Specification:
The structure is cut from a larger assembly and holds 2 copies of chain A (319 residues). Chain A has 319 residues and is an all-alpha fold. Helix content of chain A is 56%, strand content 3%. Chain A has 17 helices and 4 strands. In chain A, the strands form 2 sheets. A two-stranded antiparallel sheet of chain A has the order 1-2. In chain A, helix 9 packs across helix 12 and helix 13 packs across helix 14. The longest helix of chain A has 23 residues. At the A-B interface, helix 2, helix 9, helix 10 and helix 11 of A face helix 2, helix 9, helix 10 and helix 11 of B. Chains A, B: Keywords: Disulfide bond, Membrane, Mitochondrion, Mitochondrion inner membrane, Phosphoprotein, Repeat, Transit peptide. Chains A, B: This is Calcium uptake protein 2, mitochondrial. Chains A, B: GO terms for molecular function: calcium channel regulator activity; calcium ion binding; calcium ion sensor activity; protein heterodimerization activity.
Chain lengths: 319, 319
């Protein structure tokens, strides 16, 4: 039982024939919540239970909203859990590559034999120490003979990413349609790898206005920039040479040209009010890039008991 | 500075000419959150600031959703704060009485002179030790000569109550449209005046199913029953005589006939699975009524430093 499978069975809610399963509600909780306290216990299933659960996809919307629409009447195994988890953090321009990877070109579309190959990879990795899920029923028909083209794949992945962004936005905005700049500030500061947020809190107390809002499209654009941060930094490494701090206009032009996600002046103003440690109007790549380095936020826990190893590496490398 | 005014200035966000004000976002936070940590500081205003804030009502929806629609561009003083706070917990059949109370019958509608009378009551209570808010602009026109009929008053109060129910539902359901029975259980157990929830948690662990959902209309109906609980208990006192525990069917019929809010079998089943301490299928009024006694939940803090007085009354009356 690896760490990922341990997390999966911890956040699971259904078991059947000695095999833990999961509903979309539990997947969303695992994505957005680090730890959940389950008041109740797991429950077994039968074929009647399976049909009562799978009776939701027939009346579910295949649009942008798919998981909250399904609610609790869904089924997700470990393999689909890992697949969706990789989809969460997959940047653009890798969609077509991932699609072509999921099929040996004997089928230009994807039949369920390729997902069976994925499950076989999982089982081969497991052992070397039947049951229809909701995701298969979405991609392939109830009969099981359905081709999955690339356009539908791209649509599904975009919908999943946007659904997660909407979920995080509504979780941090308490329900309102205009979150305060402070919520965006704390959302950014959450996953930054620093030990003293005091300077950033002083900055947002002093420099940032008392009242200002952020829309939803702006938050989604910033999230897409965050997920393309690696390509953005590769493009910015040429500018980091000679140690030239970048202003706001060049920052906006560069993010637009390297990630295709044009940002507003509000978000850029805010991120420069929180991150400009120095007194100049703009600061170098150092703080923003090196500090915003993990991107492993939003669940995605990597608990390789890195506490003591982190303390040891701190004691060693601190010089 | 009374406790209510202290809470108001703590949750306020705007000050002008030495007078704290408040935006709908802060009112909603004061309603749903017991304590809020303000990262930023208060800011002053000018007439230009006043117009920039009041420029929202012109493009705001007067339907069921009004406060989240306004977002942050709104204005609420202390008097309107207290008025809305009384509206939150006002039961039905008191709407028309409250309307007739807010006007000396020289006007069958309500002109702004009666709200001026309300503000005068507040100021007379304060001193005996000009500025247009958003609510006045909603009831009365920008010019200030507008009659407010009773039907619009009832519509506004119903919309406010339903808006608060939607807010609490979305805050406890994490965004999904079907909250788990456990969330309803913990929402009920929050304001119950008991010291050991262990028995109720054992009940929900054992008796309640592992997975079951609750819609939105059912939650709203249960909230309306909770706000008519006093009339419900007056009607049930005759049945409490002879100490006869009430079953489920009679409970449903009685709540329907005394509060007009018919409940589903799911909510009643759940509340009997959490509250039936004994082994019988139904338990008497004792636990449900006496335990669910406060109804002062959802903010509405009454902090008359009742900690030490509560401990003293416990030491005294415990026999």
């Amino acid at each position: 039982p690896s760490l990922r499978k341990q997390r999966f069975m911890q956040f699971s809610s259904l078991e059947h024939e000695g095999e833990y399963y999961m509903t979309p509600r539990d997947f969303l909780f695992s994505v957005m919540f680090e730890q959940m306290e389950r008041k109740t216990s797991v429950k077994k299933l039968t074929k009647k239970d399976i049909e009562d659960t799978l009776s939701g996809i027939q009346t579910a919307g295949c649009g942008s909203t798919f998981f909250r629409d399904l609610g609790d009447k869904g089924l997700i195994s470990y393999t689909e859990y890992l697949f969706l988890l990789t989809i969460l953090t997959k940047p653009h321009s890798g969609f077509h590559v991932a699609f072509k990877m999921l099929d040996t070109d004997g089928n230009e579309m994807i039949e369920k034999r390729e997902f069976f190959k994925l499950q076989k990879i999982i089982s081969k990795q497991d052992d070397l120490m039947e049951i229809n899920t909701t995701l298969q029923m979405r991609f392939f028909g109830k009969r099981g003979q359905r081709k999955l083209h690339y356009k539908e794949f791209r649509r599904f992945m975009e919908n999943l990413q946007t659904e997660i962004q909407e979920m995080e936005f509504l979780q941090f905005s308490k329900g309102l349609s205009f979150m305060r700049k402070e919520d965006f500030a704390e959302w950014l500061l959450f996953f930054t790898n620093t030990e003293n947020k005091d300077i950033y809190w002083k900055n947002v107390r002093e420099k940032l206005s008392a009242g200002e809002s952020i829309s939803l499209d702006e938050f989604k654009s910033f999230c897409h920039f965050t997920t393309h941060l690696e390509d953005f930094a590769i493009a910015m490494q040429m500018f980091s040479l000679a140690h030239r701090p970048v202003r706001l206009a060049e920052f906006k032009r560069a993010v637009k040209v390297a990630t295709g996600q044009e940002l507003s002046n509000n978000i850029l103003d805010t991120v420069f009010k929180i991150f400009d440690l120095d007194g100049d109007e703009c600061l170098s790549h150092e703080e923003f890039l090196g500090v915003l380095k993990n991107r492993m936020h939003r669940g995605l826990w990597v608990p390789q008991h890195q506490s003591i190893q982190e303390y040891w590496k701190c004691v060693k490398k601190e010089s």
